[PDB]
């Protein structure tokens, strides 16, 4: 971007615009860019540490930061994402326009104890999208520092680090390490100015819809079917009990036992939990009681796991262990903080299609019956895909992520991430930038040492990011009224989805999106 | 319409269609029309019965019946009228369509006990609309017979009978009578059809929101004003008590002291009755302690009267005795039912602007003070239109009326109908219909005397009302989430709006349109 | 200018045929049991109550004047014209109502 | 592919509804607005035609030994298979699935 000092290199984008089939989301923001490891780049790493096997780590810290869209509150307000989720049967993104701008560039100066700042107007700020995906990409792994739900809050950039092959807390040759400046870059003065746009490959709207069916009663509830079942082993009430073979047809009084065409989607069994402490068990059984996957004699608690519901009718006080995306509530801790400042998702509108995450999918046969022996059944925890199946992905919430990178693997199943949201192959580039080293004074005379004095300094400026999404609008010929998300009506201390006295923006719940209602 | 005792004249269209800024409703529904009064025209009136002087009437009952679709759930089926209100600021009505069609006519022969029905091929049913309002305008008046709201319902056509001049029960010369022959109409046998269209005026969108800020807090809650008010007329500890002048600044502390620009909406005050039986007098006072205006010494309960909010905050146990619109459930029987057989709506959304109904207006001065004369005020019950007054009329509901002629005046003011909805000088013409008498076998020898033998008959047929709604988009910068209507989650016996298993359609509740809010 | 007088009045505008569709508070209690007592009774618009129908409109705005008979037996006995006239007051003068607001005579 | 067996289409073959039009009896003299439930008992009776186009996938086989070909009994019986019996009522001996000509995998 061309000009001056005395003259800025962008305006402030931030609205929403509605237009039939397409919504258009415009948001700005201001950011606060220090310098990260003194320009470093640091190997780090598990070593020493103290971490268990299923904990240890290699990789590599980095002097640059980010920018990070990847959550929907950075796009919708609360208004708009009621807007889309009541009127709609889903969505995607097409489009996107990115934009820096606004740079200035500032010294910090300190002595005694007190702090001056002031322009370093010469001084420049590098930035690039790695558009080849030449990167570790590590959006889509849920971090924090993505732009903030509220137009008014200033954010700190986050530092870029990724991870490799590790081996314990060393490293193999596989091992790769990546220099970021070794890129070419956009070096920005307080005049300039960047910008990119990404067009999204084409994907599945997401379904924002609750089924008014389940899978189990697809049935015309009126007549038989012209088909018939084994019924009975034995009589009958023709004294006593002697070996038979009686079979019925299909009949609205027994829809359990109908001939059907499909099966309910996949399952990986859950432990549950309930709300009210009295209820579980006086251990601590997370880590030993948790749904694991193992990787390389690395273990690795599943979560959230297959698209489940969280529970079965009347037993919203359920949960599964580690099965429900969970958000914190600005008051939480880092840590161990109490169920009260966190918030549960709830997964429940799937039950028509999805098995229960804390129960078995079903029963299978295990043996041969015979007069000798008898029939034999167990229960099925863990089942795969069936040809015949069908199923719903998660919900994505108005705090929740939106895509992530499928891993270029030879095989993918359905990749839909499973923390919810879009499977993109080729996703929006990670978009890096950085503070240029600007040297401390040199000594008079020459030392090949590597310079390691600098004047500190870090910057500031505005982010723009506007998307279009593409509306699949509802055609329902449904009579009655569905739910609605709304909000309580009945009077309170504060509104929900505002700030406070103190100027706290906060967010009261998560909105997930499935409101309306299809048939199966 | 042209062809065959064995050929539809017209289809079954019923349907929404939503296009922006328009929506079309389509409604079909099966009707049945009886002979009426014989073929006869009798005069009417309250001789005899034992009516009070408030009672009295003189009139005329007609052989016709007429069309009526003068009510929202006519055309809004629940889930249209719930995405017309979550969505839209205002609509009113642009355009109509009206087709009468697939005309049957049936005889009727009666030996014993027992009946036989036939059709009557060479039989007419005869049709006209009251384009020049010609006729005494019987719509708007809130009577039943309209289009049922669901579209599998039969329903009767009403019959046709119109009020004059009465001195009592007795007629003046002045009193008009109308025979509907003396008009042309189409004449309609098996194979014909009736059709015409309509245009509506330019009226006012119906607002469909309701306010975010009331008269009385439209300030700037930061600053000052720059106008002064007399604060106190003395001291001020200062002992004792001693006369003063002294003015303060409107301030922040103290908005309702401070100037502003504008009025309250008109007020005539109804008596507040409760829910809970137990708070009220024990008396009868309705007709004795309502609000009535007299007309010609004859007196008429106000009702619904001004548009006024039902109760004041925290109060939704009371409601003006008849100032809000009451729906009947269809448990309700047609007098003195309970209170558990009906509906009672709520218009508490327009406090923001109009006087609550059971309240006084205001106060007002009522005397010169002075040091003999202490300064006296009195309560104002009924106030008309002052110069600055602003207010918001009555909500119309999915299932009341939508719009009534206004009189032939040479004065109307705001001639909003009270009951809710539309004014319309030329509003959507009556639509009358009748069977033809057919005389039964004449005598052989001349008889002067009119004819009084007659076949028994009736018809049926399809009616198609097609309207064109303008919707006014919701523009609304607001951050945080509506109030949206919606049907309840929990789960229970029956479904909202929705028929019971003897397949009887229920409205359990009137819906209003205010969900969606502006600024003032 | 209107020509002609009305023949219906305000009053008087339904269909004497059909009931409403809506409903109104006809009692504050029963209803003979035995006593009086409490309640909340409801009845929809009828052709018997054309009263306490619900409706769209109001009459005229109205200035209340003193009425006055032609056989003069039957006026009180004094000169109440000015006195008892409708009057309004214009900067501390007043002045006779007169015709005032289009009312019936 | 639907378990119990065929042809999986997202956009099948729509349903096709049908119902005869109510026909009121003959109504009240005197209007009434509770739900009209009296009616002339009523049925109807026609035709309905269906036409499919269905595209074959020809055998192809070098196999050189005769296949397993579905075939009728030729022993002799009281009835033929797949035909109507002496009251006149259809019916299905068996069963027939598609699979008779083979391919190699
Ligand atoms: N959300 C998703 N993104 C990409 N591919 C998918 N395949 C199934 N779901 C998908
Ligand atoms: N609803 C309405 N119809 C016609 N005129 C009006 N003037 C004010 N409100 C009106
Ligand atoms: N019968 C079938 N119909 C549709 N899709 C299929 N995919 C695999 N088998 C199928
Ligand atoms: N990846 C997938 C495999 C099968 N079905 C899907 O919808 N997606
Ligand atoms: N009729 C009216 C008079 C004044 N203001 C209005 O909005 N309408």
Not at 25 to 47: E, F
Not at 98 to 117: A, H
Not at 398 to 410: F, N, R, S
Request: aromatic share 12%; hydrophobic share 30%; with cysteine.
């Amino acid at each position: 971007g061309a000009d001056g000092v005395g003259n800025a290199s962008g305006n402030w984008h931030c609205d929403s615009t509605w237009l039939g089939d397409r919504v258009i989301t415009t948001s700005t923001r201001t950011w606060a860019l220090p310098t990260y490891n003194n320009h470093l780049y640091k190997q780090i790493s598990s070593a020493s540490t103290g971490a268990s096997n299923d904990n240890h780590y290699f990789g590599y810290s980095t002097p640059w930061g980010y920018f990070d869209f990847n959550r929907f509150h950075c796009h919708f307000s609360p208004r708009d994402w009621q807007r889309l989720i009541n009127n709609n049967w889903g969505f995607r993104p097409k489009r996107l326009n990115f934009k820096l701008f606004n740079i200035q560039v500032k010294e910090v100066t300190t002595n005694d104890g007190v702090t001056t700042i002031a322009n370093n107007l010469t001084s420049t700020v590098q930035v690039f999208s790695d558009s080849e995906y030449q990167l570790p990409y590590v959006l889509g792994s849920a971090h924090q520092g993505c732009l903030p739900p509220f137009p008014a809050d200033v954010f700190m950039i986050p530092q870029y680090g990724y991870l490799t092959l590790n081996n314990g807390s060393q490293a193999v040759g596989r091992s790769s390490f990546y220099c970021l400046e070794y890129f070419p870059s956009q070096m920005l003065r307080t005049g300039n100015n960047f910008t990119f746009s990404y067009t999204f490959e084409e994907v599945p709207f997401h379904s924002s819809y609750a089924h008014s069916q389940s899978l189990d009663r697809l049935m015309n509830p009126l007549i038989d079917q012209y088909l018939y079942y084994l019924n009975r082993t034995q009589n009958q009430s023709g004294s006593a009990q002697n070996k038979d073979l009686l079979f019925s047809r299909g009949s609205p009084a027994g829809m359990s036992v109908q001939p059907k065409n499909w099966l309910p989607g996949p399952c990986y069994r859950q432990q549950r939990v309930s709300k009210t402490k009295t209820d579980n068990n006086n251990s601590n059984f997370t880590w030993t009681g948790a749904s694991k996957y193992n990787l390389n004699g690395r273990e690795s608690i599943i979560n959230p796991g297959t698209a489940m519901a969280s529970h079965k009718d009347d037993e919203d006080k359920f949960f599964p262990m580690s099965g429900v995306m969970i958000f914190g509530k600005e008051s939480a801790g880092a840590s161990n903080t109490a169920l009260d400042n966190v918030m549960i998702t709830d997964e429940e509108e799937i039950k028509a299609t999805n098995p229960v995450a804390t129960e078995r999918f079903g029963t299978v046969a295990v043996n041969f019956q015979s007069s000798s022996t008898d029939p034999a059944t167990g229960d099925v925890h863990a089942m795969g895909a069936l040809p015949g199946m069908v199923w719903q992905d998660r919900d994505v919430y108005l705090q929740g992520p939106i895509w992530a990178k499928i891993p270029h693997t030879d095989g993918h199943f359905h990749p839909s991430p499973l923390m919810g949201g879009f499977g993109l192959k080729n996703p929006p580039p990670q978009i890096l930038i950085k503070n240029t080293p600007v040297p401390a004074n040199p000594p008079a005379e020459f030392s090949a040492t590597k310079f390691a004095s600098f004047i500190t300094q870090y910057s500031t400026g505005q982010v723009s990011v506007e998307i279009e999404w593409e509306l699949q609008k509802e055609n329902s010929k449904r009579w009655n009224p569905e739910v609605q998300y709304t909000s309580n009506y009945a009077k309170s201390a504060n509104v929900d989805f505002t700030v406070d006295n103190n100027g706290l923006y906060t967010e009261p719940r998560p909105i997930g999106t499935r409101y309306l209602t299809r048939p199966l």
